[PDB]
Structures are given as structure tokens and as C-alpha cells.
Enzyme design. Structure first.
Site, short mmCIF file in Angstrom:
data_model
loop_
_atom_site.label_atom_id
_atom_site.label_comp_id
_atom_site.label_asym_id
_atom_site.label_seq_id
_atom_site.Cartn_x
_atom_site.Cartn_y
_atom_site.Cartn_z
N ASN A 33 -21.22 99.87 41.02
CA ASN A 33 -21.81 100.80 40.06
C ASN A 33 -21.29 100.50 38.66
OD1 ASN A 33 -23.32 103.14 39.41
ND2 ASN A 33 -21.49 104.41 39.47
N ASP A 98 -16.10 96.87 43.83
CA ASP A 98 -16.36 98.32 43.62
C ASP A 98 -17.06 98.88 44.91
OD1 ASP A 98 -16.68 100.58 41.50
OD2 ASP A 98 -18.72 100.31 42.02
N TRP A 99 -18.17 99.60 44.76
CA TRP A 99 -18.95 100.13 45.84
C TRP A 99 -19.52 99.05 46.73
CZ3 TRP A 99 -18.74 104.57 47.95
CH2 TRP A 99 -18.27 105.70 47.20
N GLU A 122 -11.05 94.88 43.51
CA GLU A 122 -11.27 96.16 42.88
C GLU A 122 -12.02 97.06 43.82
OE1 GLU A 122 -10.62 97.82 39.77
OE2 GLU A 122 -8.87 96.55 40.09
N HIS A 266 -11.74 96.44 35.62
CA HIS A 266 -12.45 96.76 36.82
C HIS A 266 -13.53 95.77 37.18
CE1 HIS A 266 -13.99 98.94 40.11
NE2 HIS A 266 -15.11 99.29 39.50
CL LIG Z 1 -19.89 94.94 40.36
CL LIG Z 2 -18.50 105.04 40.95
#
Ligand SMILES: [Cl-]
Ligand SMILES: [Cl-]
Ligand SMILES: [Cl-]
Ligand SMILES: [Cl-]
Lengths: 296, 292
Positions: A33, A98-99, A122, A266
Site C-alpha cells: 500500500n 509491506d502488505w 519491511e 519503508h
Molecule cells: Cl510496495
Molecule cells: Cl497500510
């Protein structure tokens, strides 16, 4: 020679990018995200000589459709599974952030046979309380606000704060206006921003939401017992994953190498595309070579 | 982070750079002519998280000793064997270039269970005649002169031409003064330069010298039968190994992947440290995981 493709899946469509020769092992690149497959554009070409690279846009992201759905974690998992089955992918290396890492973990948990190896960075894990989220108090406050009724809608739906602020704020180099333009393009309307608001509301903090906390606890347990090859990249100071936490985490796992990228936040792909790409391509070549001996 | 260490070997001494933890698999970095372990200084730190990295200075090079020996290929092989035994290295990944690759192939042929993997570039092989050497007539002419009695001595011993001319001439970027200083440090004196002259004379070209030709021919055949993973880095245009030749050569071997680095010549580590080290570390991680 990175092409873009659409496929009908469930009640919508999904787009993906593809590169490399089709007779090599599948490598699935999973963004988070509020990015899209665009984020992997400088990394895929480095993996293309040893792998068939596929980088989906998550439902509601990038060039994928915008169906009228909740956009919960489980909806994201459902659409990604359905694209994977539509493409006939039964075995793949996973590359994720991330997600995209939650999705990868949860995917490996449900289909342990699929995973040839996992490269991740991450990543998301169950966070017992807020101090376990991120590295600075300003980021906790922002995400608390995202998670607040009304406030969050105003920040992300009305002002697109995830794309316009969080994203460039967690990348060290300055993005060109062309780059930002590609990142904002899927989110021109207020309603199109919804998936970017739902995801920070799905982050498992202090047991809420409970369904995602449970699902990601099970996926971390399975990750911990997994035996497939793994590669964890980490930045300094990082965001979700500090260097010290990386070392600590890595030793709850089997066969997890920890690669230091240096200075980063990130979204590590925009600062370290070469390092990530060469690392992953070499890793795949080693796994494939070692697996061909062994099986001989 | 990279520490420098020393060991008594064969009545003299050998230096080596070291990094990584010792619970990790051994990774042996082998430099060639006229360089030293110094050439791996930007690569080793990228490989440390997955390996116990050891980079020797060959006998006569870097901070290793300068004994009264002939510095033939077999002398370098004996001293290297002895360091390896002294450090208790029984199982290793080998990372290698130039005469380091001749040493690595030769080691693997005599100790077939030592090698967990071989990452290599700009490697030496028996060359049927001068047209199999390098990619320009001018490089052929230079090494022909090295190999000619008296002429070679004047170029290398008096003028230090391997260090001052051939080395920087086959690196694209311009070495800093500090970097060049480090490459010439071990070769201040005329006598000290002997090893850099002996190695071009050892190149196996048209069956000569015959003993090294036999040794490397046999090492190349052991390489073809070998089953450990292999990673061949290639420069464009390369020097000893063109992209085209890398492609035909890889197909003679088992489980060899080729990584294209782009613009470079004979010494790839000074132009592509980041690419080489990141690839080699990913590769080692992958092989360790897949083997267990
Ligand atoms: Cl990403
Ligand atoms: Cl998020
Ligand atoms: Cl070298
Ligand atoms: Cl030489």
C-alpha cells in the site's frame, strides 16, 4: 519487454506485468500500500534472466479493476489467489514488501507446496501494541489517525495522504514528477482511494482487527516452521523492520539470510533496486542449481 | 569491519582479509595477477552476512611473504594449499578471477569434495594458440613480449608494467591515487616484481608450458564433470572471456548460471563490486538453504 496484461478474475479484472522467458521458474512480485507493479520496474529486469517474472497489481490498485468490495485483507488474498490460478501458477518464488508480505505469508500458509523461496522486506506481523508499530512517534500518530473514524476518511479519501505524503515520505531519494504521477494515477477520484484507507485499518495492532491478527499469527507460525529458502532485506533505520528486529526475527526462522541494504525507510525498491534485483537473481540461480543436483 | 590476519606457511608467511562469522560457511576469495586480497575489499562486506569470508594474499603478493622461490603456478598452488590447511578450511565456496580461477579449478580437481560452489570470472583455460588469448592483437603482443627472455624482464622488473600499465588499462573507471598506491605497495622493489612476470610465462598457450597445460587441461575436465553450482560473471566485452564465449563455455558445464555485468574489461571487481557481491551473497544463501 516488460508488458502489461489484463485477466478477468472473480467479479473484476486484474492487471499484471510480465518479463523474462516463460520456461524459467515463476517469480511473483507482490507490492503493498499504496503502490502497484510499477514499483518493481527496475528490479524485474535483473531477475528476468533466471525467472519468469509476474508482478500483479492488487485489486483496486494500479491497472487492476475497482470493484465494489470491502477491500479487506481477505478480499486482497481472494483476488490474488484467483489471478494465480487463472495464470496456472502452481510453483513460484515470491518477492514481496509491506502488505505484499502479509499476502505472501498467508499464501504460503495456505499452499505450502507452491513456494520455491521467499524474498521479503519491511514486512507485516501481529503488533502487540503501538510501540511495536514503526520506528518514530510521528508515524504512529499518522496511522492512529488513519484508523480513526472520520479523521481517516478526511486524510486519505479527501486528501490522498497515503499516496501524496506517506509514500514519498518513506523513500530517501526525491521522486521525479513522472514517478509520482504514475503513483497517483490510479487514485484520481475520492472513491478509488478506498483500498488505501482500508489497509491501514487492517494492520494487526493490539488485536484489532481480530480476523487479520488471527490470520497473520497463523501465517507467521507457518513461516517459522517452513523449510523453503528465504531472504530478508533490511534498511537502516527501516520502518516496520529495524535492523535489530531483523536479526532477532531471522533466527526464529530456518534458512533465512539477512541482507543489509543500508540507508532506507519503508519502500526499499526505489532506493535499492539494483541490490535487491541482483540479490534475488543470484539467490534463484543458487536454489535452482542446488535443486538440480540433489534431484539428480 | 574487514580484518587483516597472518599465518606461518612453508617457512614463510601469508596474509589474508577476513570478515563474517565463523559459524558460516567458508568463502574463499582468490585474486590473480598482479592484484591482492585488496581487490575484494568492496565485495567481501556484501558477502559477510552469509559466509565466513577469507581472502588470501598469494605468496609474493600483498602483505604475504617474499621467499626465494620461483613463483610458478605450482608454487602458488602449494602455498595456497598450505594456508587452506592451516586455517582448517575443508569445505568452501570459491570466488575467483584470473589466476585465482586456475588455482580454484586446480584445487577442485584435486579435492573434489571441498567445493560447495564456484563463482568465477575472467578465467584461464588452455589456449590452443594466441588467437584464443584475449580480444585484441595489442594484448597478445604485450603478453608475447612478457614471455620473451630479457624483454619481459625490462617491462616488468624494471618498469613494473603489469602493475602500472596492464592493471589500470583493463579497468574502466579511474583508480584513485590511494587505490593505485595499494596496488603498487607490494612491488616497490625490482626483485619483488618477479611473481608478476612469472605468471604470464605460465599461461597455457600452444601447449607451453607443458606441465601447466596438462594441469589445467585436467582441471577443466574435472570442472566439466563437477556437479556443484557455478556462477560465471561476464563483462562486456570482457578480456579473457567474451559474452559469446561465456555462453558456449557454460553450456559445457553442469549447473552454471551466467550473469552479465555490462561494461567492463579484465578486472571486474573494480567496476562491478556491488553487482558481484550482491549476487554472490544471494547465491550462497540460496545454495545453503536448498542443500539442507
Ligand atoms: Cl510496495
Ligand atoms: Cl497500510
Ligand atoms: Cl584479480
Ligand atoms: Cl598473467
Amino acid at each position: 519487454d516488460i508488458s502489461l496484461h489484463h485477466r478477468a478474475v472473480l467479479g473484476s479484472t486484474m492487471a499484471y506485468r510480465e518479463t523474462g522467458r516463460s520456461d524459467a521458474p515463476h517469480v511473483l512480485f507482490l507490492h503493498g500500500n499504496p503502490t502497484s507493479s510499477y514499483i518493481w520496474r527496475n528490479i524485474m529486469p535483473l531477475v528476468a534472466p533466471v525467472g519468469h517474472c509476474i508482478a500483479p497489481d492488487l485489486i483496486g490498485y494500479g491497472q487492476s479493476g475497482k470493484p465494489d468490495i470491502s477491500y479487506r485483507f481477505f478480499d486482497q488474498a481472494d483476488y490474488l489467489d484467483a489471478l494465480i490460478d487463472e495464470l496456472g501458477i502452481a510453483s513460484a518464488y515470491l518477492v514481496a514488501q509491506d502488505w505484499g508480505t502479509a499476502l505472501a505469508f498467508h499464501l504460503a500458509a495456505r499452499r505450502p507446496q507452491l513456494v520455491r523461496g521467499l524474498a521479503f522486506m519491511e514486512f507485516i506481523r501481529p503488533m502487540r501494541d503501538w510501540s511495536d508499530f514503526h520506528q518514530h512517534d510521528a508515524a504512529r500518530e499518522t496511522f492512529r489517525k488513519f484508523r480513526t473514524p472520520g479523521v481517516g476518511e478526511a486524510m486519505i479519501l479527501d486528501n490522498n495522504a497515503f499516496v501524496e505524503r506517506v509514500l514519498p515520505g518513506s523513500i530517501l531519494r526525491t521522486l521525479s514528477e513522472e514517478e509520482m504521477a504514475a503513483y497517483r494515477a490510479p487514485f484520481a477520484t475520492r472513491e478509488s482511494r478506498m483500498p488505501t484507507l482500508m489497509l491501514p485499518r487492517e494492520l494487526p495492532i493490539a488485536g484489532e482487527p481480530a480476523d487479520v491478527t488471527q490470520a497473520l499469527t497463523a501465517a507467521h507460525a507457518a513461516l517459522a516452521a517452513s523449510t523453503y529458502p528465504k531472504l530478508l532485506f533490511v534498511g537502516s533505520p527501516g520502518a516496520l523492520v529495524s535492523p535489530a528486529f531483523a536479526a532477532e526475527f531471522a533466527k526464529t526462522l530456518k534458512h533465512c539470510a539477512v541482507i543489509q541494504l543500508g540507508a532506507g525507510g519503508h519502500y526499499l525498491q526505489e532506493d535499492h533496486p539494483e541490490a535487491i534485483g541482483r540479490s534475488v537473481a543470484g539467490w534463484i540461480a543458487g536454489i535452482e542449481a542446488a535443486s538440480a543436483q540433489r534431484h539428480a
